[PDB]
Coordinates of C-alpha atoms and ligand atoms in Angstrom, one line a residue:
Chain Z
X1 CA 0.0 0.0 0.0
X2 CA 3.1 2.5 -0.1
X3 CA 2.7 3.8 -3.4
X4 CA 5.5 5.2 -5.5
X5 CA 5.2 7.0 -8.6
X6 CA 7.4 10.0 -10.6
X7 CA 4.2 12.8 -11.3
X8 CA 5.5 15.6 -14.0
X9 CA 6.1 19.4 -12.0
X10 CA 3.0 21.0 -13.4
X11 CA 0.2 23.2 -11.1
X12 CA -3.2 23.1 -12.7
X13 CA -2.6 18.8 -14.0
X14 CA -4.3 16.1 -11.5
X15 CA -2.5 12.9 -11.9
X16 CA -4.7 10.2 -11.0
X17 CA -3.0 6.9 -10.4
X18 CA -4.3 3.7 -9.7
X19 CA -2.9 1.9 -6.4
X20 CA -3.4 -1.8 -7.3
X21 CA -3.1 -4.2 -3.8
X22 CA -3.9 -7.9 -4.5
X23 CA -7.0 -8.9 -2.6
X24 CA -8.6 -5.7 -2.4
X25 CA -10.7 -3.2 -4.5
X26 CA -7.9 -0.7 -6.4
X27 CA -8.2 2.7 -4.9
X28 CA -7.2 6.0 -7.3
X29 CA -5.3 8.7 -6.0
X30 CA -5.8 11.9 -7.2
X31 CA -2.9 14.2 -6.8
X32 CA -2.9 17.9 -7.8
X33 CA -0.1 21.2 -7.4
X34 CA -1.6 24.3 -6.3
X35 CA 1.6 26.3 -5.4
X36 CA 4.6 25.2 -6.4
X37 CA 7.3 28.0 -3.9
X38 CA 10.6 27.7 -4.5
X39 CA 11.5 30.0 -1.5
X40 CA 15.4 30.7 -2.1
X41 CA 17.3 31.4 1.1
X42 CA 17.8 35.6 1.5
X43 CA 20.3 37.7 3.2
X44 CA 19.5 41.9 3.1
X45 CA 22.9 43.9 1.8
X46 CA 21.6 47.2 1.5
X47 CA 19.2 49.6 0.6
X48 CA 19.0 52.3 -1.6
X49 CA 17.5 54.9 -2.7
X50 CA 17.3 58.8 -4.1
X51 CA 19.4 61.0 -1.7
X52 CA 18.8 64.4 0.0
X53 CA 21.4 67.3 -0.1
X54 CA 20.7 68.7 3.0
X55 CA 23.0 72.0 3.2
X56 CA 23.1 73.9 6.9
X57 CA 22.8 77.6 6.5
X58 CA 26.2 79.1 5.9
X59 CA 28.4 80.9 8.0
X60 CA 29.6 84.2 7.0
X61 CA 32.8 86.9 9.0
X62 CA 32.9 90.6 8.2
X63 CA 36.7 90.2 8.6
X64 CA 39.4 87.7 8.8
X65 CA 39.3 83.7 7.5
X66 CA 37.0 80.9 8.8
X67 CA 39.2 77.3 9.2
X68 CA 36.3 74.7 8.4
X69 CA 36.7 71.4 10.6
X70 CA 35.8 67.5 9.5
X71 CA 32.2 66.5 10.8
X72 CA 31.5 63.1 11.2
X73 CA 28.4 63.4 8.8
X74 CA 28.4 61.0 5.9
X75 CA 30.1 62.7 2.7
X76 CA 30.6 65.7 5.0
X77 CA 32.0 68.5 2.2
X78 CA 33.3 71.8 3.6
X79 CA 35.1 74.5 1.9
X80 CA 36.2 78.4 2.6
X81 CA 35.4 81.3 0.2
X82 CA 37.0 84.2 0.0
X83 CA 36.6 87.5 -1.6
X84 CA 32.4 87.1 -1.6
X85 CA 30.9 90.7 -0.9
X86 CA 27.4 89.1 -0.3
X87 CA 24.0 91.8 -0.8
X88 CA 21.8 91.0 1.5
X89 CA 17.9 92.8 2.8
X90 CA 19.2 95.8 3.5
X91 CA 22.2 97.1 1.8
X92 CA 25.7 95.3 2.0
X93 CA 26.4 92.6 4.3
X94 CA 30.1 93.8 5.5
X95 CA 32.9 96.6 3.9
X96 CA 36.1 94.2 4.7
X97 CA 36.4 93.7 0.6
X98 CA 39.8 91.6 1.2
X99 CA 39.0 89.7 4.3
X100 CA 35.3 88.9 3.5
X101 CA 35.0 85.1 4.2
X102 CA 32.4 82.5 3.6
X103 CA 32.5 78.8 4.9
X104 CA 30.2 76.5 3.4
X105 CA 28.8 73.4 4.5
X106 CA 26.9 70.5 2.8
X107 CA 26.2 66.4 4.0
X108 CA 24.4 63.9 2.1
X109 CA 21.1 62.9 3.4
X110 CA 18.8 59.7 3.2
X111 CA 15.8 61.3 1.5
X112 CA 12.1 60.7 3.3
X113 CA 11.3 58.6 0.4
X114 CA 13.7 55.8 1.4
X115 CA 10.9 54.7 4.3
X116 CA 8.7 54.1 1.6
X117 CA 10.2 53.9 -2.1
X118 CA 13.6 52.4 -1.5
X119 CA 15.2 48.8 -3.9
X120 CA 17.0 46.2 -1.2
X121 CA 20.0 44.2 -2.5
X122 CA 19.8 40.5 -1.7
X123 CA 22.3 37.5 -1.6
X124 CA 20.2 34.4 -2.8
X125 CA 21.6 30.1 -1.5
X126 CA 19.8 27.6 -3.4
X127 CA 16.9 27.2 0.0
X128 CA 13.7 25.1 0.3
X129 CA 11.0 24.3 -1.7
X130 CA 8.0 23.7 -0.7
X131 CA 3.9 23.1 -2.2
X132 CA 0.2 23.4 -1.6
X133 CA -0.9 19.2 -2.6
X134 CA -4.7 18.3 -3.0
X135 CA -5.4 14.7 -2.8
X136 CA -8.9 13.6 -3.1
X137 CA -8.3 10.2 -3.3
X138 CA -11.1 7.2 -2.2
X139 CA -14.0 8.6 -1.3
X140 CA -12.7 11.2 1.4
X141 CA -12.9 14.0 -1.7
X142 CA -10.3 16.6 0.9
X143 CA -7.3 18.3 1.3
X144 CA -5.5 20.9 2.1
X145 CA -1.7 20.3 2.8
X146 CA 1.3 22.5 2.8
X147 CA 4.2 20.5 2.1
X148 CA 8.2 20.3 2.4
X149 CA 9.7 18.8 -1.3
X150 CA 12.9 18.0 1.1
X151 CA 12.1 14.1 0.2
X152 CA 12.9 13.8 4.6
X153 CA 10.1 15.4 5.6
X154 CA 6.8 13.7 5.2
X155 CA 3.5 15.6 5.4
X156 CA 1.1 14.1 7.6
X157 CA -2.5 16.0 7.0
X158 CA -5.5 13.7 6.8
X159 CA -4.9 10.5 7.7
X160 CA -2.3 9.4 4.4
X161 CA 0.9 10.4 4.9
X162 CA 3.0 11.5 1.7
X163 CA 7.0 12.1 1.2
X164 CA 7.2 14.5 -2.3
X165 CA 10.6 14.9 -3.7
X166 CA 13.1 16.1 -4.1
X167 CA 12.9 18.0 -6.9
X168 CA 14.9 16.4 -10.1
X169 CA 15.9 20.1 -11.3
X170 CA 17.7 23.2 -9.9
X171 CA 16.9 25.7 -12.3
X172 CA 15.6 28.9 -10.1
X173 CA 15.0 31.8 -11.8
X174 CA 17.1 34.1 -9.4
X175 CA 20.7 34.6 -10.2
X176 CA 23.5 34.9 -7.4
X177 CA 22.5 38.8 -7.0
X178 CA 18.8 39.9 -6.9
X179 CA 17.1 43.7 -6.1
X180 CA 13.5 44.1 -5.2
X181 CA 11.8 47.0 -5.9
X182 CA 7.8 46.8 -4.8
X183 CA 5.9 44.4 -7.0
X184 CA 9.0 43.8 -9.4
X185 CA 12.6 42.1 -9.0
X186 CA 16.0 41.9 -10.8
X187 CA 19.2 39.9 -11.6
X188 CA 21.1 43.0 -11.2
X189 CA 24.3 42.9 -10.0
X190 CA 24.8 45.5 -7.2
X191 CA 28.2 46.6 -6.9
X192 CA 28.9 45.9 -3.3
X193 CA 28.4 47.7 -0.2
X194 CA 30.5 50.7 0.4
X195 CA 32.0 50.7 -2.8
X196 CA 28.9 52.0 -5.3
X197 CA 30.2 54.8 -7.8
X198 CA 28.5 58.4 -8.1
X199 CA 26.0 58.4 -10.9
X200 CA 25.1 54.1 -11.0
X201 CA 23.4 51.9 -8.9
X202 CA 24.1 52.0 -5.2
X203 CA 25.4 55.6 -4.7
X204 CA 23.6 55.8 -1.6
X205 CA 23.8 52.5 0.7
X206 CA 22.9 52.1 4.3
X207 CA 22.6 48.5 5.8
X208 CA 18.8 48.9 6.6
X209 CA 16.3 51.9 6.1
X210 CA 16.3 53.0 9.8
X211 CA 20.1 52.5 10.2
X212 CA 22.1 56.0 11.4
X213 CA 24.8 55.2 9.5
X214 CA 25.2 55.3 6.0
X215 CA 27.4 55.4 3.1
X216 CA 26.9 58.0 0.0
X217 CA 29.8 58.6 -2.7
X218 CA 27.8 61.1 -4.6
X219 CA 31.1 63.1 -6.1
X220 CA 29.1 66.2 -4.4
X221 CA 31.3 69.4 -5.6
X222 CA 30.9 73.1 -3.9
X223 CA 31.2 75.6 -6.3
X224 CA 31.8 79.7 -5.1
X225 CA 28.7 81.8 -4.8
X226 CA 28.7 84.8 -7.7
X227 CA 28.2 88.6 -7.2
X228 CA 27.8 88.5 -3.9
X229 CA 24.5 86.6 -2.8
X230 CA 24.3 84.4 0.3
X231 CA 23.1 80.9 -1.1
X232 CA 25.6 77.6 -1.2
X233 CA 26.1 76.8 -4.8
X234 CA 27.2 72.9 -5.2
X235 CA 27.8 70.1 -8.3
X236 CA 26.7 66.7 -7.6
X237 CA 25.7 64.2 -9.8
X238 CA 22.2 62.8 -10.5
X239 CA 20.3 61.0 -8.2
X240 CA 22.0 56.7 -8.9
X241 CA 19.2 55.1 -7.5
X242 CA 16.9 57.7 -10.2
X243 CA 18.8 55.9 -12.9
X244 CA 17.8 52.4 -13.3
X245 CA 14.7 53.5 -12.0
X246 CA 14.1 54.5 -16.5
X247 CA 16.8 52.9 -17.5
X248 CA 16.0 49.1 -15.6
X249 CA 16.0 46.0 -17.2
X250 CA 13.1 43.6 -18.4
X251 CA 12.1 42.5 -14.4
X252 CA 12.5 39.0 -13.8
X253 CA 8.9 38.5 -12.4
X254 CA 8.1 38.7 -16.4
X255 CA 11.2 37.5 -18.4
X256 CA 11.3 33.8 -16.1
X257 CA 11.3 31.0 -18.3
X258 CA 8.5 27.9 -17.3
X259 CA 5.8 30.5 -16.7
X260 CA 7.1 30.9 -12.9
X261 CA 5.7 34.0 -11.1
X262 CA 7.3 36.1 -8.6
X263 CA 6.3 37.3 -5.3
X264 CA 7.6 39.2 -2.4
X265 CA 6.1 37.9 0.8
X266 CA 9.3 35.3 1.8
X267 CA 10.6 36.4 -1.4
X268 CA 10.1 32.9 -4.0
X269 CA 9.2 32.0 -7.4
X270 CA 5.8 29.9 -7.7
X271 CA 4.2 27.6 -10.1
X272 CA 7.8 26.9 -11.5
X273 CA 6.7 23.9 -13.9
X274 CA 10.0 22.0 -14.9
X275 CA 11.2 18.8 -14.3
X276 CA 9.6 15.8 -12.0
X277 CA 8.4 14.8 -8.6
X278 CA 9.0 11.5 -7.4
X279 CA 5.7 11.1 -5.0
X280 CA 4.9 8.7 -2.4
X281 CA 2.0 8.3 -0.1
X282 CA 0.8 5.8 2.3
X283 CA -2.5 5.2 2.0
X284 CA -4.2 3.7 5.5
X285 CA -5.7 0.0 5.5
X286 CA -9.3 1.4 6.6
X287 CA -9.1 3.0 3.0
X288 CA -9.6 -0.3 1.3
X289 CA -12.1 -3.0 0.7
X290 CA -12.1 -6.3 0.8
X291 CA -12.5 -7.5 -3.4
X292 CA -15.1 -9.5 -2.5
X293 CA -17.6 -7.1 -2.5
X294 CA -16.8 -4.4 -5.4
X295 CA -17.6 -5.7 -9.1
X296 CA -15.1 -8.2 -11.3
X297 CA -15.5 -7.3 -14.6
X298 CA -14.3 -9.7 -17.3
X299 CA -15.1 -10.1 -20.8
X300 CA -15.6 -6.7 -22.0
X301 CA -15.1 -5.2 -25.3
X302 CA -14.2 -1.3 -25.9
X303 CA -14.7 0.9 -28.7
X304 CA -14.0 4.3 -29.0
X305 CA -16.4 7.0 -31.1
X306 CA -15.2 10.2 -32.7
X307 CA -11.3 10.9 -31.2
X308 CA -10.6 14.5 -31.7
X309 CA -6.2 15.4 -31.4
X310 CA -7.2 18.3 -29.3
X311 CA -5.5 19.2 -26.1
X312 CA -9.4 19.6 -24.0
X313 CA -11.4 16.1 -24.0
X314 CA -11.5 14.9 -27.7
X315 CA -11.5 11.4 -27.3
X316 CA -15.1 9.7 -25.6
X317 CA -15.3 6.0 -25.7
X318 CA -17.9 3.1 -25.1
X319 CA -17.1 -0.2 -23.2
X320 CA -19.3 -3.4 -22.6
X321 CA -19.0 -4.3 -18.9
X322 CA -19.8 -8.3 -18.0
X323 CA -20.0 -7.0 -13.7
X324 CA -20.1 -10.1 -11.1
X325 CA -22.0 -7.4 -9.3
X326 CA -23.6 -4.0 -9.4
X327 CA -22.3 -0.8 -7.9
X328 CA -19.0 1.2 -8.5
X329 CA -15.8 0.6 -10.2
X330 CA -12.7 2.7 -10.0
X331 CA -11.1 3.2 -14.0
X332 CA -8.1 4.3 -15.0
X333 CA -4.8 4.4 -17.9
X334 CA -1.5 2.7 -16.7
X335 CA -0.3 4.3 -20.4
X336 CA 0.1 7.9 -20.5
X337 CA -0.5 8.5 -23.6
X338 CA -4.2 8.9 -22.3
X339 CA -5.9 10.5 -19.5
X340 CA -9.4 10.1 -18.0
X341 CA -11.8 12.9 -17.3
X342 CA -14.2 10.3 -14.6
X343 CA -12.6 9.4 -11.1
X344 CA -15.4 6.3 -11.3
X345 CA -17.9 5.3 -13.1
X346 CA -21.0 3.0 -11.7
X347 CA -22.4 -0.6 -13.2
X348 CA -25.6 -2.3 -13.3
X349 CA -25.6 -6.5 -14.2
X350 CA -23.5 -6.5 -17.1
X351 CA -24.3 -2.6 -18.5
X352 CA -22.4 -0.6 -20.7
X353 CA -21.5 3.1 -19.9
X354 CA -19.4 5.5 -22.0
X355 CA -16.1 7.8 -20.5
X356 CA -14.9 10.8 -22.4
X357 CA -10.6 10.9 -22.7
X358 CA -7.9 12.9 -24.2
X359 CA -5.1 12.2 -25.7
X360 CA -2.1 13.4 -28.5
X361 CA -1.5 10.7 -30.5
X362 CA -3.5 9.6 -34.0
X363 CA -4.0 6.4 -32.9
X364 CA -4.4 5.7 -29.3
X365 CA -3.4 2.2 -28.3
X366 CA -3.7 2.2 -24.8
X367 CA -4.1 -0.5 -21.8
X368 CA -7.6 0.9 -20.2
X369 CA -8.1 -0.3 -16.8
X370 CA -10.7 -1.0 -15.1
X371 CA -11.0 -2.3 -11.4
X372 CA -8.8 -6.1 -11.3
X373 CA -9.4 -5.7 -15.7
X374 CA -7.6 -4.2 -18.5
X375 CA -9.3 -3.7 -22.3
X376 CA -7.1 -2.9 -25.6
X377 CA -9.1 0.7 -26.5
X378 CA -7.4 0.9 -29.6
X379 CA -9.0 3.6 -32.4
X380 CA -7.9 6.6 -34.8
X381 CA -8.4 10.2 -33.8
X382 CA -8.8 13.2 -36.6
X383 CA -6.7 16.8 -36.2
X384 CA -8.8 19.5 -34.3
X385 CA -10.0 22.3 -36.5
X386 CA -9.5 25.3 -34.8
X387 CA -6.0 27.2 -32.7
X388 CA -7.9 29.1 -30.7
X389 CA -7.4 27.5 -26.9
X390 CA -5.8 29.1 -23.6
X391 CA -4.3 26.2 -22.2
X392 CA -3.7 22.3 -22.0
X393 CA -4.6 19.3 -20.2
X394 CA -2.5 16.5 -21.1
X395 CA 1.2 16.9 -22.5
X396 CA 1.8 13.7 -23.7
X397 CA 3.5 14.2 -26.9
X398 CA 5.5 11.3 -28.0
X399 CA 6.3 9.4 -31.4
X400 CA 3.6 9.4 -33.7
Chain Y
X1 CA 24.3 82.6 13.5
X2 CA 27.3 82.4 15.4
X3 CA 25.8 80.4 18.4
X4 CA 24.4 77.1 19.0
X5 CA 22.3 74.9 17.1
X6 CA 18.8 75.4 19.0
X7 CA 16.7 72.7 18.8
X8 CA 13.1 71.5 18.0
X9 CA 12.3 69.5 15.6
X10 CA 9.7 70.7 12.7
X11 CA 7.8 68.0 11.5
X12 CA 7.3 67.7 8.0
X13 CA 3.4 68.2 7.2
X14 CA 3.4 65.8 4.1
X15 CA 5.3 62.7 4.0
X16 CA 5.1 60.2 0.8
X17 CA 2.5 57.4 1.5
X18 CA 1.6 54.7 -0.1
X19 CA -1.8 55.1 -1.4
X20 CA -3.9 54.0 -4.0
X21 CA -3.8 56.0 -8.0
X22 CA -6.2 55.2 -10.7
X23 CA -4.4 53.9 -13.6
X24 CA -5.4 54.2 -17.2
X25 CA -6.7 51.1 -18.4
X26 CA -5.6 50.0 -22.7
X27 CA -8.2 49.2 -25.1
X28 CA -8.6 45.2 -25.7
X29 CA -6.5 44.0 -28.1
X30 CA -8.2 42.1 -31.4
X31 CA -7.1 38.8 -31.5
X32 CA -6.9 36.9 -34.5
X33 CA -5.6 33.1 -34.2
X34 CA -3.2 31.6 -36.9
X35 CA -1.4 28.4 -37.3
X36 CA 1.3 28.2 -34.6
X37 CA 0.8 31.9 -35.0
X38 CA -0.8 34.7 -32.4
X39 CA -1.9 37.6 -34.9
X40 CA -2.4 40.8 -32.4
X41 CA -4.9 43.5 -33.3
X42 CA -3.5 46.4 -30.9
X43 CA -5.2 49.9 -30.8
X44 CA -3.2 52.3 -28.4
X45 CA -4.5 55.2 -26.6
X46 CA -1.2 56.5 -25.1
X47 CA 2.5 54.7 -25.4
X48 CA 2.1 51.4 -23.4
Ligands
LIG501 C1 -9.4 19.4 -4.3 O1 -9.9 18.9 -5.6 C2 -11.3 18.7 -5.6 C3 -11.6 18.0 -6.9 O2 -11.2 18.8 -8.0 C4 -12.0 20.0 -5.5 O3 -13.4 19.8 -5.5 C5 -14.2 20.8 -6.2 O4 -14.1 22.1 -5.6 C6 -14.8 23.1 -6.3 C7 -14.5 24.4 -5.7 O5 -13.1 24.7 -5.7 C8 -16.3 22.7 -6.3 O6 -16.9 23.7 -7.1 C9 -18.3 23.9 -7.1 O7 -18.8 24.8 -8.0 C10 -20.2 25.0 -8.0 C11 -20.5 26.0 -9.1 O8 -19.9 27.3 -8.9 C12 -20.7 25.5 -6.6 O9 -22.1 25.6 -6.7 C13 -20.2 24.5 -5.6 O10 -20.5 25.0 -4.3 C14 -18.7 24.3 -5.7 O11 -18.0 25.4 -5.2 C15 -16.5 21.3 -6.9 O12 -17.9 20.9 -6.7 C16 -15.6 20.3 -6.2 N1 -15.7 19.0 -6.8 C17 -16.7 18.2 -6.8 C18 -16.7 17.0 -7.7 O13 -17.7 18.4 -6.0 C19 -11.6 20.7 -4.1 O14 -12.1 22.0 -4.0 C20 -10.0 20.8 -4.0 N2 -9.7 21.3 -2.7 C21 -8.9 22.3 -2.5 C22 -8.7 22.8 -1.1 O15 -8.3 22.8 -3.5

């Protein structure tokens, strides 16, 4: 009763297998992927954003210099001007028009914008993976387990246990160096922290937003205030966190390959269909029936009507059942190159009920099964007529 | 001035938030299926 099967990584596909014990009625799982999160492990570097050139008002003497002295504020700039005859309200400011001084003083600022509006650097390990499985196997039709892929670490929700896992393929969508910026993120590769050049990405870094500290190499210039007005002139170059804010990249949350999506919450990538799952479950003894009660059905005969090669349910079929009994009788494909739409399907004495299919293969020669019989339903399927669909429920393109 | 730094702090009235903007919304596009081929009828109001 501990089934093990390989199931392909894809969210929306239920892949209902057939658990077969001896002496009892087959039961059919029913497996399906609602999330698929990759959850990479994260570490913060820094945070950036557009700066703030906060300039103090300046100090100005009548006569005789001013010697500036190094504050401890971040990209502290200070400089001494001399000659300036500054015009100021009423009249002239001083008549000393050699030993006029100005000192001027200007530190680089973490805007207010940074609390809300601000990209964060991360450093991305390959992490954990983990899933949302439904299983509505039997008749217990429930689930709603959040599950580990670490093949360790069974899930134990319901009363079957299941291992999934691990995953065959490594392929996340994050690079060694993200940035996240609200809704969107980015292989960029931030320089480092410390060391981020005027003008690109990363001029202004500070560990976290609400840190003191911070480091800002903004090349900020002071330049000397002309005929004579009191103001604090200064060069600095444009805003780096400003470019790359028009100048960024195609965001990852859009250029992924596999059709993952992207969202912030742990940081992860979700829905990431590649590769396979081995999965294993272990369904519990009270789940089965003794075969002595559920129908045999030998001696039946299949034959399928008009097979479309469409990706939806082309294919619908007819079988002649010869039941020991009446009631119901799980049905399934060991072949995958078909796939049932019913769970079950329910006999009278030696009926005959139809099951629609689909398939991708002009002529389908699969094993159908039925509970303790299999049937040869083999037929010939005609090209769909039409491209217009959204999306598939099948993928089982093979030699044909 | 020549003095000290006197103190208080000024709060700033408006600080950024994050609220809530309407958003233009694009005309629907015209689809027009071909084989292995997604023919796109597009109609722009502004660059999008
Ligand atoms: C696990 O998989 C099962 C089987 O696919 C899910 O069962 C189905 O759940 C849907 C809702 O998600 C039920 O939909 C029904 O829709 C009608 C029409 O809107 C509404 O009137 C019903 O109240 C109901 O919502 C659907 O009936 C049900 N399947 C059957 C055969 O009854 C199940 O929801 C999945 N569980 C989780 C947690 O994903």
């Amino acid at each position: 009763y501990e089934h093990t099967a390989v199931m392909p990584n894809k969210v929306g596909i239920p892949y209902k297998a057939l658990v077969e014990r001896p002496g009892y009625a087959p039961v059919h799982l029913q497996i399906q992927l609602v999330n698929t999160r990759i959850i990479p492990s994260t570490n913060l570097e820094y945070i950036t954003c557009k700066y703030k050139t906060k300039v103090p008002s300046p100090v100005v003497k009548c006569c005789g210099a001013t010697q500036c002295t190094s504050k401890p504020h971040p990209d502290y700039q200070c400089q001494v001007f001399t000659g300036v005859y500054p015009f100021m309200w009423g009249g002239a400011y001083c008549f000393c028009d050699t030993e006029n001084t100005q000192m001027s003083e200007a530190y680089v600022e973490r805007s207010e914008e940074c609390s809300i509006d601000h990209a964060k650097a991360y450093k991305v390990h390959t992490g954990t993976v983990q899933a949302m499985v439904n299983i509505t196997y039997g008749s217990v039709s429930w689930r709603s387990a959040d599950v580990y892929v670490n093949g360790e670490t069974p899930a134990k929700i319901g009363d079957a246990k299941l291992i999934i896992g691990p995953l065959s393929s490594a392929w996340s969508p994050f690079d060694n160096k993200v940035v996240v910026y609200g809704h969107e993120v980015y292989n960029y590769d931030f320089p480092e922290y410390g060391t981020g050049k005027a003008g690109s990405f990363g001029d202004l870094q500070s560990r976290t937003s609400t840190s003191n500290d911070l480091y800002a190499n903004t090349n900020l210039k002071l330049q000397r205030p002309q005929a004579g007005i009191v103001h604090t002139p200064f060069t600095q170059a444009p805003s780096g966190f400003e470019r790359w804010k028009r100048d960024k990249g195609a965001p990852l949350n859009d250029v992924a390959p596999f059709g993952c999506s992207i969202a912030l919450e742990p940081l992860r990538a979700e829905n990431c269909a590649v590769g396979s799952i081995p999965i294993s479950i272990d369904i519990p003894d009270a789940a089965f029936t003794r075969i002595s009660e559920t129908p045999t059905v030998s001696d039946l005969e299949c034959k399928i009507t008009e097979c479309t090669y469409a990706s939806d349910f082309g294919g619908i079929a007819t079988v002649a059942y010869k039941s020991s009994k009446a009631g119901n009788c799980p049905i399934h494909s060991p072949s995958g190159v078909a796939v049932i739409k019913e769970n079950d399907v329910t006999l009278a004495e030696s009926g005959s009920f139809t099951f629609h299919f689909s398939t991708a293969n002009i002529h389908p020669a699969f094993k159908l099964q039925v509970c303790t019989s299999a049937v040869t339903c083999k037929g010939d399927c005609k090209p769909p007529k039409d491209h217009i669909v959204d999306y598939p429920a099948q993928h089982t393109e093979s030699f044909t | 001035g020549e003095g000290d730094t006197f103190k208080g702090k000024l709060h700033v009235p408006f600080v950024p938030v994050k609220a809530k903007c309407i958003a233009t919304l694009a005309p629907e596009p015209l689809v027009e299926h071909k084989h292995r081929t997604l023919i796109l009828h597009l109609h722009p109001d502004h660059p999008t």
